[PDB]
Amino acid sequence: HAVSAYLADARRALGSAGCSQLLAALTAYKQDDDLDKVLAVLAALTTAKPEDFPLLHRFSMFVRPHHKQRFSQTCTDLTGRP
């Protein structure tokens, strides 16, 4: 139940509107395969406080195999290694 644990943590840290924006961006990503767009929503929401940085890295669970390397590189440039 990694997904429900992520959604519980994200709704707690980001609030309902922020969690809803993250899930809408995930929906859009599954439709359009645009990694940069989903990453930009996620980074706006999860890098405002250092304590939310793990929610940036943990989003990798939803990132498609062909984008996981680039996603991990960008998250490390934003926040360091997890």
Author numbering: 14 to 95
The publication says:
The regulator of telomere elongation helicase 1 (RTEL1) is an Fe-S cluster and DEAH motif-containing DNA helicase with ATP-dependent 5′ to 3′ helicase activity. RTEL1 plays essential roles in telomere maintenance, DNA repair, meiotic recombination, and genome-wide replication. It is a modular protein consisting of an N-terminal helicase domain followed by two tandem harmonin homology domains 1&2 (HHD1 and HHD2), a PCNA-interacting protein-box (PIP-box) motif, and a C-terminal C4C4 type RING domain. RTEL1 is an anti-recombinase and executes non-crossovers by promoting the synthesis-dependent strand annealing (SDSA) pathway of homologous recombination through disassembling displacement-loop (D-loop) intermediates during the DNA repair and meiotic recombination processes.
All the helices are mainly α-helical (3.613 helix) except the N- and C-termini of H4 and the N-terminal of H5, which consists of short 310 helices. The overall topology of RTEL1 HHD2 is similar to the N-terminal domain of the human Harmonin. A sequence alignment of HHD2 corresponding sequences of RTEL1 across the vertebrates, showed that the evolutionarily conserved residues are mainly present in the core region stabilizing the tertiary structure. The electrostatic surface potential of HHD2 revealed a distinct pattern of positively and negatively charged opposite surfaces. RPA 32C binds mainly to the solvent-exposed surfaces of helix H1 and H2, while DNA binds in the pocket formed by helix H1, H2, and H4, suggesting HHD2 adapts to bind DNA and 32C on the same surface. The electrostatic surface potential analysis, in combination with NMR CSPs, revealed that the positively charged surface of HHD2 could interacts with the negatively charged surface of 32C. Using NMR spectroscopy and isothermal titration calorimetry (ITC), we showed that HHD2 also interacts with DNA using the RPA 32C binding surface. This study establishes HHD2 as a novel accessory domain of RTEL1 that mediates both protein–protein and protein–DNA interactions.
